[PDB]
Design a protein around this nucleic acid. Structure first.
Ligand code: ZN
Lengths: 120, 317, 53
RNA sequence: GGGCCACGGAAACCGCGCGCGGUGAUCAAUGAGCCGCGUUCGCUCCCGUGGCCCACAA
RNA sequence: GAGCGGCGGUUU
């Protein structure tokens, strides 16, 4: 799998990531698409970054993991950009998403951040 | 899949005892990085979006070059092989412009056509074609895949052939019409899709890995010696004793030749090389290979463009 | 963009799996590049790691 | 005289396209639409100025 | 100044 994928995320955890995004979308605040995702990390607004594992060319999202660690912001991978798009509430794919305000997903987002911390 | 530049040439030995002095000249792998750039050519993978001119402007700014020039212009939406000759190698593009090209293209038909007729009708376009008035060769066409109205093919053509117009004429031959929806150049002369083909991202990153990290290896591999731009041409190799003369504007006389490619006709563009395979100059043959071979005096090549500096070889005259 | 190529075969195809190699194919055009290159610093960080620089 | 080399043989604005910044879309989030800012390489002849050579390869 | 291989226009 792509080189920008810095660690293995279990099927369970990946499914939770999509849930968080889905919940954060209608009960909180998210940004979708790599440009908005990146701006959110740069402005220090992202509580969690979700990156698709099937992005081609890799250069579209490969800056995110280093940028996130710089800003010390948790990031996690999900298998499918198409499916990440749907969760983000659009009918097109999304190579990456940023949760700005978790909403009903405060706990889920807190959990995820803990498991990735272990995977790093 | 065969273009004229792919012809195997035979080497003819004129002077069995010619030898080269390892202390003179700089064969590509003895070139310090800075000199390597001065006589360098980039096999660039142009991205869709910018014009070709813009892409070269970016390269000059980012790599702090004074001069650079690209070969066959690629249109804004087209990706792929774009040779970019740098600094003192810049004028070598003149050897590439006339060389064959290859493309992979995606054609979108405007009506339904059977795969067999599409294939059969495209095959008819191999050989000469006239397009908007001038004649142009199509060396080969290979249909890779058809999906409904989408036709993916490879095509090798003479310099100056417009693939757009070719695709348009195919659409008319089929009656339903067609346009070109995607184009990528996969070869221009000696430049092809291999490990030397490098994107802008790799080019600039490798550059910084050199300037800022002190790692010369990646950037050095991003740049090809100018000799590469001449690989498709007939060559005559000359003795050390004639090299400084030629760099000073002397024509190349028969007594100066060590060996040479067969098949050279009068008027041909040839590359004059040293015995270390350095590019000295471009010129025009005033003799055939057999003439250069059997004669003992007279001008063999009219020297037109000199690339090697005058102080690489001593003035042995 | 629809033209893809096999990283193993070199084959050009519209399919996601190479009809020759059987390998996953990749988009044939290079990524778009900006003279501004806003994330260059971070892409280099990822690339040095990949190359072991 | 001849060859080779260098420099010169216009400049400023507009438009498309493209890029960036901003906003972020009822199948273009790998970025729509809109706003603002940017943005196009050389080569060959010939001619002018200047430089290096005149070297059948010893 | 004359042409080839993405520039289309208005100005001295
Ligand atoms: Zn294969």
């Amino acid at each position: 799998k792509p080189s920008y994928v810095k660690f293995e995320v279990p099927k369970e955890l990946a499914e939770k990531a999509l849930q968080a995004v889905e919940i954060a979308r209608d009960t909180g605040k998210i940004r979708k698409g790599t440009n908005e995702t990146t701006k959110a990390v740069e402005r220090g607004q992202a509580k969690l970054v979700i990156i698709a594992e099937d992005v081609d060319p890799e250069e579209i999202v490969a800056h995110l993991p280093p940028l996130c660690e710089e800003k010390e912001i948790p990031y996690i991978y999900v298998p499918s950009k198409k499916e990440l798009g749907a969760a983000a509430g659009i009918e097109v794919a999304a190579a990456s998403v940023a949760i700005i305000e978790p909403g009903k997903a405060r706990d889920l987002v807190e959990e995820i951040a803990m498991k990735v911390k272990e995977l790093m | 899949r065969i273009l004229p530049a792919d012809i195997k040439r035979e080497v003819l030995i004129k002077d069995e005892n010619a030898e080269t002095n390892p202390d003179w000249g700089f064969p590509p792998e003895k070139r310090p990085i800075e000199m390597h750039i001065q006589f360098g050519v980039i096999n660039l993978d142009k991205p869709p979006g910018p014009t070709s001119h813009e892409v070269v402007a970016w390269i000059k700014k980012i790599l702090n070059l004074e001069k650079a020039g690209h070969g066959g212009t690629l249109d804004p939406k087209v990706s792929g092989v774009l040779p970019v000759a740098l600094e003192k190698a810049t004028r070598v593009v003149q050897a590439l412009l006339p060389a064959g090209k290859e493309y992979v293209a995606l054609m979108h038909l405007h009506g339904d056509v059977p795969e067999d007729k599409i294939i059969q009708v495209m095959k008819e376009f191999e050989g000469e074609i006239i397009q908007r008035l001038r004649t142009r060769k199509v060396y080969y066409i290979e249909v890779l895949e058809i999906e409904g109205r989408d036709v993916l093919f490879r095509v090798g053509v003479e310099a100056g052939t417009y693939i757009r117009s070719l695709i348009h004429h195919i659409g008319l031959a089929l009656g339903v019409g067609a346009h070109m929806s995607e184009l990528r150049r996969t070869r221009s002369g000696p430049f092809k899709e291999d490990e030397t083909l490098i994107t802008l991202h790799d080019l600039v990153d490798y550059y910084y890995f050199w300037k800022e990290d002190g790692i010369e290896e990646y950037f050095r591999k991003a740049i090809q010696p100018m000799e590469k731009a001449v690989e498709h041409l007939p060559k005559v190799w000359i003795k050390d004793s004639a090299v400084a003369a030629v760099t000073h504007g002397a024509d190349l006389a028969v007594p100066g030749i060590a060996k040479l490619h067969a098949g050279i006709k009068r008027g041909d563009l040839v590359a004059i090389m040293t015995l270390k395979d350095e590019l000295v100059a471009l010129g025009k043959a005033m003799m055939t290979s057999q003439e250069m071979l059997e004669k003992t005096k007279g001008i063999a090549v009219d020297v037109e463009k000199v690339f090697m500096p005058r102080d690489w070889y001593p003035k042995l005259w | 963009f629809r033209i893809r190529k096999c990283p193993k075969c070199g084959r050009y195809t519209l399919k996601e799996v190479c009809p020759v190699c059987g390998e996953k194919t990749k988009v044939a055009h290079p990524p778009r590049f900006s003279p501004e290159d806003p994330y260059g610093e971070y892409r280099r960080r990822w690339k040095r790691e990949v190359l072991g620089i």
